[PDB]
């Protein structure tokens with residue numbers, strides 16, 4: 001999916017990580033793909049070249065990468081949906097959750113029925129040039145009944161208070177047991 005830096009120069013950033021066997025979350029710049037373990041927090045950076053209007057929001061949503069599966073809503077597999085690992089905020093069917101934010105909104109589109117999690121857009125902290133949001137994926141890419149080995153993309157959109165699109169940028173994701181190993185291979 002095409003990126004849209006838009007009027008505010010919106011784009012994502014990821015900390016530099018290696019491919020060590022014990023790494024729990026590692027991003028690959030050449031593949032623009034995030035490799036992470038189940039339920040492990042992944043810090044994603046939000047960069048802008050100009051401050052967005054007040055009341056702006058940041059939405060995260062997963063879609064299947066391959067054309068033939070793109071219309072299918074991405075959800076947790078039945079097994080994980082019933083494992084009772086809820087934090088009291090996120091519905092059990094949602095794949096993506098946010099951690100460390102007091103204002104997450106777990107939404108379900110009234111027309112497409114796709115899931116997403118939204119948090120307020122907040123400026124970078126003192127002496128910082130990016131904002132960090134911590135995301136976690138509650139299902140493995142291999143989960144049958146779920147993503148079933150189908151690659152997904154995580155679309156991050158910057159929206160105004162009215163829900164209008166301001167910016168967009170995405171990355172592929174693979175939720176596996178050994179992020180370090182899989183990254184080097186795919187690379």
Ligand SMILES: [Zn+2]
Pocket residue numbers: 076077078079080138139140143146
């Ligand atoms: Zn699962």
